[PDB]
Amino acid sequence: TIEINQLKIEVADRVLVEIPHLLVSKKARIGIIGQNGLGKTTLMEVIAGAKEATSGTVTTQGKLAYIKQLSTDTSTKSGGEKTRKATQHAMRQNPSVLLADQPTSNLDVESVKHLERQWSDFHGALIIISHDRAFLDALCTEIWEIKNQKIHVYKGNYHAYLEQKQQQENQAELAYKEFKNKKKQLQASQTHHEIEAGRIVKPGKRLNNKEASAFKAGKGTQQKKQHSTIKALEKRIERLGNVEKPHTTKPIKIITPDNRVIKKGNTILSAKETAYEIAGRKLFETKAFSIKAGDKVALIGENASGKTTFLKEIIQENPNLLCNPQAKIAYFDQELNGLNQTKSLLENISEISVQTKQVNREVLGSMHFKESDLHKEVRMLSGGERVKLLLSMLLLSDANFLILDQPTNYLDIYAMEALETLIKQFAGTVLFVSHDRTFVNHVAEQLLVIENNEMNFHRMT
Amino acid sequence: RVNITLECTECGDRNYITTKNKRENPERIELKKYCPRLRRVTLHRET
RNA sequence: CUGGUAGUUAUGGCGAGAAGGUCACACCCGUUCCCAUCCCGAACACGGUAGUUAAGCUUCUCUGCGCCAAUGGUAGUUGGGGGCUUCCCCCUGCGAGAGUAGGUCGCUGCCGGG
RNA sequence: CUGAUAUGGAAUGUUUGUACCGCUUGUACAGGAUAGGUAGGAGCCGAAGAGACGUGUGCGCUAGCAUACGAGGAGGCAAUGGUGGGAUACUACCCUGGCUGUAUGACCAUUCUAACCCGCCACGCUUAGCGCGUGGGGAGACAGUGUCAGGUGGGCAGUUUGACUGGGGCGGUCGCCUCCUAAAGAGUAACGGAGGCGCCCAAAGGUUCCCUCAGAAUGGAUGGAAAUCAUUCGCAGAGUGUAAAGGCACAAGGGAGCUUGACUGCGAGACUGACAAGUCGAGCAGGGACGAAAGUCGGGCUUAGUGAUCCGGUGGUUCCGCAUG
RNA sequence: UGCUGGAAGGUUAAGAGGAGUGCUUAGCUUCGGCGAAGGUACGAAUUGAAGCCCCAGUAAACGGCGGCCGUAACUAUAACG
RNA sequence: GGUAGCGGAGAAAUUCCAAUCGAACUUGGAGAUAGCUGGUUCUCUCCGAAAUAGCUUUAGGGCUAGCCUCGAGGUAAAGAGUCAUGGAGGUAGAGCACUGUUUGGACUAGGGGCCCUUCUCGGGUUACCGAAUUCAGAUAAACUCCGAAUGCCAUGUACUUA
RNA sequence: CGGAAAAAGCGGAGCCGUAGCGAAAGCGAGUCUGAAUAGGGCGCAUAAGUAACAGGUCGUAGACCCGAAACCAGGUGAUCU
RNA sequence: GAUCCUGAGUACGGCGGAACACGUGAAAUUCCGUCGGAAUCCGGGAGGACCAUCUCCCAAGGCUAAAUACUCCCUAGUGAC
RNA sequence: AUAGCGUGAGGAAGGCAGACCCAGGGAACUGAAACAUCUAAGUACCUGGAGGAAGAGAAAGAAAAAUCGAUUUCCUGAGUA
RNA sequence: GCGGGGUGGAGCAGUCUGGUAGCUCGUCGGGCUCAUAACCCGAAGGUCGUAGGUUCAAAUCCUGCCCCCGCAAC
Ligand SMILES: Nc1ncnc2c1ncn2[C@@H]1O[C@H](COP(=O)(O)OP(=O)(O)OP(=O)(O)O)[C@@H](O)[C@H]1O
Ligand SMILES: Nc1ncnc2c1ncn2[C@@H]1O[C@H](COP(=O)(O)OP(=O)(O)OP(=O)(O)O)[C@@H](O)[C@H]1O
Ligand SMILES: [K+]
Ligand SMILES: [K+]
Ligand SMILES: [K+]
Ligand SMILES: [K+]
Ligand SMILES: [K+]
Ligand SMILES: [Mg+2]
Ligand SMILES: [Mg+2]
Ligand SMILES: [Mg+2]
Ligand SMILES: [Mg+2]
Ligand SMILES: [Mg+2]
Ligand SMILES: [Mg+2]
Ligand SMILES: [Mg+2]
Ligand SMILES: [Mg+2]
Ligand SMILES: [Mg+2]
Ligand SMILES: [Mg+2]
Ligand SMILES: [Mg+2]
Ligand SMILES: [Mg+2]
Ligand SMILES: [Mg+2]
Ligand SMILES: [Mg+2]
Ligand SMILES: [Mg+2]
Ligand SMILES: [Mg+2]
Ligand SMILES: [Mg+2]
Ligand SMILES: [Mg+2]
Ligand SMILES: [Mg+2]
Ligand SMILES: [Mg+2]
Ligand SMILES: [Mg+2]
């Protein structure tokens, strides 16, 4: 169906993807994975024809429907509603091959279940990007890792991928172990023959001057033979090869400046019981509550539940929701409006940082942005890097009260673990949303729950 | 830092080769250079 | 005489001191127009002459610094020849640098006003 | 060792595949609620058996849907409205799968036997433990043989395994730039003394205009030995993308604007020089940039930043094109 | 590392397959060019063994059989950690 | 009597296979190839080198150039030597005007101590040192404000000479 | 062919030179490059070759003479061991 | 000239090799081994891949002197041996 | 019945000229200033067949605006393509 | 001279890939116990040998020195 050949995808100075040959089949079911910043979405756009490659070709067959990573449809609907709209639109188009970039970003459990069932029953080609491991297990039968600027192909589910990957890991460690050992072994023998060679020409005490002088030349030749053994060992070391140490990918963790340390137990937000509505239609009834300082408050709900609406009410300062003074709110949106798409990111973050330049750069380093990235447009960034930008900007702002609608969207496992660490260690206060049960279990000290049009509060997990 | 052919827009004929730093100049360069086929100055962009 | 403009290796300069002038050169006055300054009518640019020779500028004085500067000798040296050969001596020719006697506040030329 | 194929054929059967007939399948969200699509569509089904009730089975998103069975016997649903991307009845053509049935077509397995094989027996040629023939028995489409292909392969083979060098060897070096040596033109060796290169710059180029540094003395709020500021002194004690030498302040050092001459064809003549190559080049033409103009501009203050042919690749072309096109 | 055994998957040939693409031209076109059949050059999917990757085992198989700190009523050393 | 050399036999040593064995003897390809050594035969006459550059799987080889010879050419006679004149050039020497190395003296930021004290803050300060700054004097292949002799480039009609 | 192992005669097929330039098409005392009529390269201007002999040298052949250890092919040898 | 015949497991093609000056090269032509496998007169081959057109020619069967090569020999003879 | 056995009629067997040619099989030394493709070379050598010659040979040819008419050998083409 | 290393008290990572101070044992404190150990609860302790560089920032990249363990030399 789809043929890919000699494909070079180069972004600026770096080479993003390099592919000798690939081919996709009818009835295929593919995952395509990799850390943030590696070129999944760019490759996808290049297949779809949204983007051109510096080299090589793609050759398609039939209709292809391309769901995008980032919703541009600024509109009056929920994030999940927008995501499912785009998805069902792509499927309504009746495609042969179906392209998809992180479709489970803003979805919940029921929507993910219905999606994975519908795409099981789907018959035809499809390519998926997602970090949902269970979703990939449910769906895909081939898996393409964009690692080290190349595509490493794997079969079976993500389960079997992890299996074959662990085999490769162990296999490489074994190889490097052997290689280092042989090198120590032969280079030791090389030192041994150096010692011998140095001794070949120093006569014993037992010898005489005149007697020793007679075999100087033959001992010189013994010495020569030793040196020849040495050079032979060096050749064998060359023939071992330049076996490379295996790559230990560096962890992520966020480094936060000590903004303000107001007392654990201080009431940060008092919210009285109130029924809410945005177009007149009722969303839910708040039963009253308070939120104290140091609280890691989760906020839970289905799609279109009232969550983002409630956060907007907070930051707009409804008098029914009194955040105390000295609170220093800092907001992150589902649809990333908090960035200026005009500015470079050093601008976007050095304008909003109350903090030192060194500290600004430390936090960017903790998000693992390279020196190459600082002058990139916000238009120019991964779905994950934009999230990291807003969160890094949020941490530079002097805030004592973070508030985060779905930061788990376009993050990998390393960054989700680092964010978990952040929220779990954070000195101030935080109110987050996420449809990841894993993240919310790992992080939630307290819970705000929306169910059957009833909001509630629980100091549980 | 990479070598770059420059093709003409009216011809598509690769009249020049030069260089650029591929980070500080990430885009296809455009420069006005003489095209000997046409015997006039013409805009050439990178390939 | 003075305002420009040149050439000449600073003997031509640096410094100090003195006299003179809206005839010019200026300083100065103003920003109304051109045009201007990472700001600023300081500069540039424009429009004017109320005050002044204080300074720039012209002229003059000097040897403090600087620069130039021989003569004689010494060094080194081409060639030749001697030895005692880390090196050195002699014959002929050339010949310093340093330092000194001494020189220097410019010297020639063109155009215009007066 | 392994596979394909010929010698080399007859069945049966599993498991997949392909096409066809049938029968069930179709739930994001919102929405009466299980909405596949396209179109028709306002009426449509049905006492020759409707809705609804009771039971089981199957599916499944576990909401309910379909399917048959007992009684019963005519009633139901849609249109309409709203929901929504889209409408509900029913009709047909589709699509997506799932099952039955057929028909084809692969892989693999089991069996058979007539090819092939038997270093099994009996007989015969025949006084023969060879061979061949005949009859049985046994293996049997395997083996073996040929052709092709992958793997293993020091069992065997043909060869390679640097030069300088105070002997060879180790160590170091091998090409390019800069100083000293190098004896005041040039050149000039050593396993002689010191360092650098295998780049960078879309402005660190071109032009036009503008100005001038280091460091010290003080005076000063954070601010200090030393940030920035004012005055004075100051031929360069700075800077010159990068090593050093030469050179540069009437810029080649710093800013700003406009730009792309970091152009095409070439080039009298010189330098250097074994050859290969390297270097400088006024000027002519074309068409431009800057500047009023003069005029400057064929990269960067200069000198390193690189590698032959052969073979391949890309683009282009009023070239050829093995009788003619 | 070899040897043995396994049998799910990955990689893996020749051969089988032959989607398609160029060249050609009977006609169609105006020049440019478009072009059925056939022939021709090249050929993708799919299929495709052993071996290798992989898992167990195996040393009278090839082979291999370590460091640092402290510690006793004290002087040393360390049964011990 | 059998085993015969890409082989055989080996109580195994590179042992033996007709006085030959890390691969027999013989014949042929075969006049192997040899950048290696040796040798290369009569006479006189004229001229007469080099042992250098550069490149080289190159270093005791080769190739081109430089150097020799023979022949023929061509002239705005170009060669060589000296004299005169004009020039590039930074050596010897000398010098310190920069850069380094350095001696003595003046003088000091600052460090160490005795301390007075004391929130050791600031002083008495010490020749116990001491960055630097400055005066005089030394030194230099990779230092130069200077700077020869010689040698080099040329010009000339000078004066000889080939 | 002719003929004495001759000499003539015959034999003009072919070879060299007379025109070069260009990768070639091709143009031609010009040609190639190039936009050029420019300049420059090569040529012509600036005209002597050819056949045979002899001398020098070079190449292919053993190529100056002698000389390896070794390699390959066909055979002979177990009367020694 | 109704009809019929005109060299079949070849001619070609794939794979593997070789010979043609031609080393798989764009590789025509010829031959060997193995797989496949034609038309046969409105037919078939070649003209250096290949296609069309044109031209030339009839394979897969056989025979064939002379001119050419050599000299253990015979006869007569020659030599700036 | 064939095999087999026997008899009779023919035929061959082997040698050389250390030459010339046809086929089967087929080196290395050497050269490339190493060397492996390549060369040496289809040479030397083995073997088989022969004959006085052999082999080849009467176009499924060579060629191209023009045709020629079986093979072989020599001169040229040409050290060209 | 050649290799390893020098990170709380001990042993070890982390360095190659600059922002991340970690594992085990131990120490201090409070509990349990008649008391010690074990166990349970908390906490401290490293400017990464050192002096300088590069960088916005260094355990980490560059340089010099000083130490320890081996191996050589002697
Ligand atoms: N036009 C561009 N210019 C420069 N850099 C770009 C451009 N487009 C993308 N990039 C960068 O190149 C990289 C490729 O990002 P890309 O969106 O392909 O990653 P991803 O793996 O799909 O990300 P994610 O997991 O966040 O969705 C990122 O670092 C991105 O910022
Ligand atoms: N400005 C608005 N006007 C009209 N309707 C709105 C508006 N904002 C939100 N809604 C509606 O309110 C409902 C819930 O809105 P909201 O997006 O805040 O939900 P949510 O629980 O945060 O969802 P999610 O996590 O999926 O984004 C949706 O039906 C949405 O369409
Ligand atoms: K013998
Ligand atoms: K010309
Ligand atoms: K061929
Ligand atoms: K023909
Ligand atoms: K014959
Ligand atoms: Mg992305
Ligand atoms: Mg061997
Ligand atoms: Mg050989
Ligand atoms: Mg040597
Ligand atoms: Mg010199
Ligand atoms: Mg043709
Ligand atoms: Mg195995
Ligand atoms: Mg031995
Ligand atoms: Mg030979
Ligand atoms: Mg010989
Ligand atoms: Mg003489
Ligand atoms: Mg001196
Ligand atoms: Mg000197
Ligand atoms: Mg014998
Ligand atoms: Mg043919
Ligand atoms: Mg073939
Ligand atoms: Mg051949
Ligand atoms: Mg064949
Ligand atoms: Mg042809
Ligand atoms: Mg050779
Ligand atoms: Mg750190």
Q: Where are the domains of chain B?
A: 1-47
Smallest CA–C1' separation from B39, nucleotide: D287
| Contact call for residues A416 and A434 (beta carbons, < 8 A) | no
Position B41, amino acid: V
The SS3 call for residue A69 is coil
| Contact call for residues A455 and A432 (beta carbons, < 8 A) | no
Distance CA A253, CA A442 (A): 16
* DSSP bridge partners of A143: A31, A154
Distance CA A422, CA A413 (A): 14
Instruction: Starting at the earlier edge strand, list the strands of the sheet with A321-323.
Output: A289-292, A267-271, A321-323
> CA A250, C1' D119: Å apart?
72
Distance CA A175, CA A229 (A): 25
The CA-based angle A346-A348-A353, given to 5 degrees, is 85
Q: Which two tokens stand for residue A257?
A: 């400046």
Q: Which atom of ligand 2 is nearest to the CA of A80?
A: 26
Distance CA A72, CA A82 (A): 10
| Contact call for residues B6 and B46 (beta carbons, < 8 A) | yes
Nearest C-alpha of chain B: how many angstroms from A265? 51
Which residues, by CB, come closer than 7 Å to strand J?
A: A 191, 195, 198-199, 202, 245, 247-253, 255, 357-358, 361-362, 364-366, 368, 371
Distance of CA A48 to the CA centre of its chain: 23
Distance of CA A56 to the CA centre of its chain: 28
Q: Whose CA is nearest to atom 13 of ligand 1?
A: A37
Phi, psi of A327 (to 5 degrees): -95, -45
Distance CA A408, CA A443 (A): 12
Long-range contacts (CB closer than 8 Å, 24 or more residues apart) made by A158-161: A158/A31, A158/A133
The SS3 call for residue A23 is strand
Looking at residue A337, the DSSP 8-state letter turns out to be T
Query: Using N-to-C axis directions, what is the helix angle for A216-240 and A158-199, rounded to 10°?
Result: 170
CB atoms within 10 A of CB B7: 15
Q: Kindly report the length of chain A.
A: 461
Distance CA A135, CA A128 (A): 10
Chain B neighbours among A 9-28 (CB < 8 Å)? 12-13
Position A68, amino acid: K
Distance CA A268, CA A121 (A): 49
What is the stated resolution of the deposited model, in angstroms? 2.9
- In 3D space, the residue among A298, A332, A310, A295 whose CA is nearest the CA of residue A438 turns out to be A298
CB atoms within 10 A of CB B42: 17
A372 vs B: CB within 8 A: yes
- CA dihedral for A313, A319, A322, A327, sign (positive or negative): positive
CB atoms within 10 A of CB A381: 22
Residues 6+ apart with CB under 8 A from A296: A423, A424, A426, A429, A430, A432, A443, A444, A445, A446
Beta-carbon contacts below 8 Å between A and B: 8
Phi, psi of A46 (to 5 degrees): -75, -35
> Half-sphere exposure of residue A273, counting CA atoms within 13 Å on the CB side?
7
Residues 6+ apart with CB under 8 A from A234: A190
Query: Using N-to-C axis directions, what is the helix angle for A383-396 and A357-366, rounded to 10°?
Result: 140
Distance of CA A79 to the CA centre of its chain: 21
Distance CA A76, CA A85 (A): 13
Could you give the dihedral angle defined by the CA atoms of residues A411, A414, A416 and A418, in that order, rounded to the nearest 10 degrees?
-130
CB atoms within 10 A of CB A357: 10
Q: Which two tokens stand for residue A26?
A: 């009818």
Q: Cα-atom radius of gyration of chain B, to the nearest Å?
A: 11
Regarding the beta carbon of A400 and ligand 2, being less than 6 Å apart is answered: no
How was this one solved? cryo-EM
Q: Which atom of ligand 2 is nearest to the CA of A305?
A: 21
The H-assigned helical ranges of A52-157 are: 79-92, 109-121, 133-139
A258 vs B: CB within 8 A: no
Looking at residue A344, the DSSP 8-state letter turns out to be B
Distance CA A269, CA A293 (A): 9
Q: Where are the beta strands (DSSP E) in A272-411?
A: 274-277, 282-286, 289-292, 296-300, 321-323, 329-332, 401-405
| Contact call for residues A381 and A343 (beta carbons, < 8 A) | no
